[PDB]
Amino acid sequence: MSLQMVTVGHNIALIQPGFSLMNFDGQVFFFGQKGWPKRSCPTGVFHFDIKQNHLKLKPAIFSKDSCYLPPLRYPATCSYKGKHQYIIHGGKTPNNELSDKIYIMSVACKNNKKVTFRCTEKDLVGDVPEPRYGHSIDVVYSRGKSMGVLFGGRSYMPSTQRTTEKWNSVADCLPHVFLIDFEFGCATSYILPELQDGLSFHVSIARNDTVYILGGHSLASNIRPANLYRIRVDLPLGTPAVNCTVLPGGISVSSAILTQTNNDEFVIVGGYQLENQKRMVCSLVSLGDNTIEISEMETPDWTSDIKHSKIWFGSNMGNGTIFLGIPGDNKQAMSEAFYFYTLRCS
Amino acid sequence: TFLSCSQYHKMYRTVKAITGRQIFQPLHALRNAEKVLLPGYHPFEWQPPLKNVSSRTDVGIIDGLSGLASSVDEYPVDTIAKRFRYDSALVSALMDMEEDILEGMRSQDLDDYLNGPFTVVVKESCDGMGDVSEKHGSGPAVPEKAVRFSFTVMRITIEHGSQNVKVFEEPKPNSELCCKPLCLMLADESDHETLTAILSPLIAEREAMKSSELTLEMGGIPRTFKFIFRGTGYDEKLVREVEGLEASGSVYICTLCDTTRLEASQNLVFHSITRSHAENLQRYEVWRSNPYHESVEELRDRVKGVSAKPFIETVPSIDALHCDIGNAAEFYKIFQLEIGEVYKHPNASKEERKRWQATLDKHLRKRMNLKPIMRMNG
Ligand SMILES: [Mg+2]
Ligand SMILES: [Zn+2]
DSSP states (O other), rough: EEEEOOOOOOOOTTOOSSSSSEEEEEEEEEEOOSSSSSSSSSSEEEEEEEEEEEOOOOOBBBOHHHHOOOSSSEEEEEEOOOOOOEEEEEEEEEEBBOOEEEEEEEEEEEETEEEEEEOEEOOOEOOOOOOOOOOOOEEEEEETTTEEEEOOOOOEEESTTSSSTTTOEEEEEOOOEEEEEETEEEEEEOSSSSOOOOBBSSEEEEEEEEEEOOOOOTTTTTTOOOOEEEEEEESSSSOOOEEEESOOOOOOOOOOEEEEEEEEEEEEEOOSSSSSSOOOOOEEEEEOSSOOOEEEEOOOOOOHHHOEEEEEEEEESSSEEEEEEOOOOOOTSSOOOEEEEEEOOO | OOOOOHHHHHHHHHHHHSSSSSOOOOHHHHHHHHHSSSOOOOOESSSSSOSSSOOOOOOOOOOSSSSSSTTTTSSSOOOEEEEEOOHHHHHHHHHHHHHHHHHHHHHOOSSSSSOOOOEEEEEEOOEEEEOOOOOOOOOOOOOOOEEEEEEEEEEEEEETEEEEEEEEEOOTTTSSTTOEEEEEEOOTTTOHHHHHHHHHHHHHHHHHHHTEEEEETTOOOOOOEEEEEEEEEEEEHHHTTTSSSSSOOSSSEEEEEEEOOEEEEEEEEEOOOOHHHHHHHHHHHHHHOOOTOOOOHHHHTTTTTTOSSOOOOOOOOOOHHHHHHHHHHHHHHHHHHHTTTSSSSSSSHHHHHHHHHHOOOOOOOOTTTOOOSSOOOO
16 A cells, blocks of 8 residues: 555566566566567566566566467466466457467476576367457366366457458457366356356456456446356366356456455455546455455555546556556656556555 | 638639639539549449448448447557548549540450450558648647558459450559558557557458459449459568568568578579468468477577568569669778778778778769768669
8 A cells, every 4th residue: 555656667668558467486477568579589578577666677588398479468367376387368469369279388497597488378179268358267176176267258249240340349258157177178168047248357356166256347238247246166076066146245346456465365456437437446355264355445545647647557466566557648748658656565 | 722612612702703604613513523533422243242341332431440449448549540441442443543444445446345354453552651740839749650551553454355455554653643542540650559450451351352353334334343452562661560570680681582691691693582471371370389399599590580470461572762772882882992902901990991981082072073971862
């Protein structure tokens, strides 16, 4: 709850709305640059080191047996610890396309202040989901086994009913739940009667047996559902079992950022309350055994640049730190076009 | 003459009052005359259904974003893109050049009634406009860079049985009066994502029209039309970006051959064109997949510098200006090296070479009376 301005280096143009901040042993890695990889960083990943309120962007190379991936502007990342690695699905190709390939990003070597990734791809079989962005995927454990839970977001129109004047028009995907097994790349869709319409730009929180869906925006009605979801899942030896329940206590928030403050206790930051005005209130979620309670913070004061702007973005840095970005105001005509701040969660 | 509506009406009423007769035309007549020429007026059809393309034939200017996602929870973008439809623009251009092609086919000793198909070779071009800001003062507020996307019908050919004959050829292909614009937007040329999002519908329409058959009723009888597109109106800065290659830092310099900068200095003339769109897509797929599990340097020199995915089939070309300025820039240093007597001096100094340059410049200005300058031109 303490605002702090951060100065940027020379390669500031590589930051675009919808980046990715991965965490490995406390070290933060920036992914999802702007444009295409140049001659300096042929991969696209950087060390997001910050010293004396000044961030640097040192490139990171891949392994000899790795696979180079294009940057994504709205991917779906989940912390899969089963060593430590991440799983990226979805995204948006810089050529305004949607990829539906799973990228397994892991650290294979780290010595002499140099890291080395072993990014590989994995295909999907069975009930494969259509390419989409804005979705969120999590991993749940049951009976000692792990399984990936993914809730769809939005995507382009189907190729059959796609025209020229709506070549870029998108729509919310079908409200289905997909279970992806990373051991064999097997995907299985599940239909739930309580799901009414699609949802995009929501918050996904799970504690080892149930994924919580908070906030989000629906394009079909151009509103934000104020009802949270409780998806109790279980993986028996035979056929899987998934159940969903509706509970009061939702928050009309969209494009919010989620991070961890303490054990089984997270915090929601300001996203977008309405389509026109700016959201400033923030809430905190505290988990226990099966119940869940939400609460607010002590209204941390912001600067004049944040209150006078209209849009922003950002993500979390893993160790209870929110790194957000404010676009430069064209009225001043003397700015780097992207201001950046940090919040000490504590 | 760049005449506004108010001033034109003033001139019209003044001439009508001072002469008595109505020699000029009113404003509504001019509006009708300009609407009868805008795209989306004359009917047409296509033999294939042209999937993913609407069949409505009375549309003109449209938003170039083609159903954008300008919501607040989406990637921000501040551009104003206005465009015509490709088939509508082609039909409008054909209805415009109807009289010209009729006169041409009459002069070519052909019958007034003759169906197609008319092989229409069209040139494609795209280039920015630099600065278009109109801020008088208040300091340099914004650069406000603009960009356009236009086409130009290059030639029209028809056959009588088996023998072909060029029925229409443009007198000035690379001129300003033959630039038919498709789209106009305010975006930087280096801005890749917005440019791709704006140009994807046009590329889709072009690749869908590549294998279609237009049918028109311009000369009172049904006429069939084919099309052949050639994207040769791209400069080096854009052909090194839309094709997937590196912009300027790659060792590979030839946009047609895979010869490195080091091998180019040794092999001068013996080369061949070994680049195309399909092979570029294949090389990008190999770069992305990397099935051989090799190092970064060897993979880079195996993909020949391809790092980005191409999405526009381009046909690169050069002009005489760059060739002659390059030859002259080389011959200038050749003259410097031959006047400095370096073949006997293995290692010279930079100051000695500057003295050589100054002496050569003075000698040239005294004998040939020429003004030397580092800024080179044509
Ligand atoms: Mg140019
Ligand atoms: Zn060459």
